[PDB]
Design a protein around this ligand. Structure first.
Ligand code: FPQ
Ligand code: FPQ
Ligand code: MG
Lengths: 252, 253
């Protein structure tokens, strides 16, 4: 088991061509709808299916079978992305191909900056057999724009875009620490394309750059890809009855 | 559950104890009977802890379990282990130690030594040792000063550049934001500059412990580093000779 070392999922993300990635919120989207969606994501050629939410409860019982249902519907890697909780670390279920581990470098709480990683690894392997664990994608996670929800939960402070001083410190850490990926997120605004470009230029060639938050159109996906993103995530755009139309346009 | 990476009894002692010298015994060089003699004197001098440390080691567990037990039987001071990690194993550990000092080599060009050694170590926990019996972990930023091809070849470190404070300021932002417990400034072949010690003391939080070591052989040097803000001044080599009791009195006096 690679665990924190590069594995199959990271290799796939590094080698696949850049593009959109749909994020299914498993605590909002019924499993039957996730399964329908998963079949389309495969046809569209996305690199992976992310299951992610800021909120969760009864994680293991809900997610082990949710992950299994999704994997029965798509051959694409299923990657989990959820915040950690003191006393438990990051949530995990057997069957997931990988867990995205966000180190919230802009947080004022050292638990969310990185000690969550120590609690998670201490608890490993736990109830899940060693060879069956998901791979761990070590990720620098940064938040943009006003966001009191993530701020109250995780201690994050919006990254300053007044200059490159803060961002450059995060790039030095991303590189020296050997992180696998950088995830740029905005809950309420949009990550600036200029920031995406700055990150693509400052990161090593094998470091994967994800951007998400309020992406609702194919034009936005193209703009972020043109700015250097490897993957552009989107969740909310498909949380409605007419999601097939929306998905076609965002991917089109 | 064991405090592990959370602050525990050893960190509280290091935070609260009067600043001063700390003798470091290299257990792979110093015979255990001599370590026990030394431990008794360290206790009388009221040092904060006894560090057992070496750059080199082999057969760690069979050598160190009884060595640590002998030293613990000779002093009530906490016994702290400090050794480099090895890929595939992480940091070495034995039961009975009070704490392991975990160095994150922020100046290394190898990400394993920068911090992935911590992930390998915690993944392996609890391993062969019962959870309640594990040592506490002191999360430490470790930096090297001066030419040192030995640590460079072994761990990938590059000497910290003091031509500006840019590099150390980035390490201080990490030490603070990541909530490290301690910072360890080391020079294998030279001396950490007292002005760098002052820079770190001024930039760290009040609860972050600052250790300096490397070629400390006189009481004057200990005083200069304490005056500069070091919480602890480590010294090993000065006592690796027959006349160590005289050397110890001069360094601690
Ligand atoms: C803060 C952070 C990056 C990591 C900490 C862990 C954490 C809070 C993980 C949850 C996943 C996440 C970052 C945001 C939630 O929704 C968006 C899609 O947004 P849209 O509906 O606008 O398309 C997504 O999953 O990307
Ligand atoms: C490079 C680093 C700080 C950590 C990585 C792990 C590592 C190499 C740990 C071994 C302990 C160490 C840092 C130096 C060895 O001797 C000195 C004192 O020297 P003196 O004989 O000159 O008094 C000591 O133990 O401090
Ligand atoms: Mg473990």
């Amino acid at each position: 088991p690679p665990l924190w070392r590069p594995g199959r999922v990271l290799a796939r993300l590094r080698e696949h061509q850049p593009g959109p990635v749909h994020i299914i919120d498993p605590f909002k989207v019924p499993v039957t709808e996730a399964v329908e969606k998963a079949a389309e994501l495969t046809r569209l050629g996305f690199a992976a299916v992310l299951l992610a939410s800021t909120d969760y409860e009864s994680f293991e019982s809900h997610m082990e079978p949710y992950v299994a249902a999704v994997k029965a519907a798509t051959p694409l890697p299923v990657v989990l992305h959820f915040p950690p909780r003191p006393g438990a670390g990051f949530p995990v279920v057997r069957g997931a191909d990988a867990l995205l581990l966000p180190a919230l470098l802009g947080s004022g709480d050292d638990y969310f900056v990185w000690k969550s990683f120590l609690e998670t690894l201490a608890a490993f392997p736990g109830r899940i057999p060693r060879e069956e664990w998901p791979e761990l994608l070590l990720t620098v996670a940064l938040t943009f724009g006003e966001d009191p929800r993530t701020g109250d939960l995780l201690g994050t402070v919006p990254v300053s875009t007044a200059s490159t001083e803060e961002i450059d410190r995060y790039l030095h850490v991303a590189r020296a620490f050997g992180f696998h990926m950088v995830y740029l997120y905005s809950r309420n605004e949009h990550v600036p394309p200029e920031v995406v470009r700055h990150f693509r230029k400052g990161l090593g060639p094998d470091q994967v750059l994800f951007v998400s938050g309020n992406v609702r159109s194919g034009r936005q996906v193209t703009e972020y890809l043109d700015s250097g993103a490897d993957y552009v995530g989107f969740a909310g755009a498909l949380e409605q009855p007419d999601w097939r139309s929306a998905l076609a346009e965002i991917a089109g």
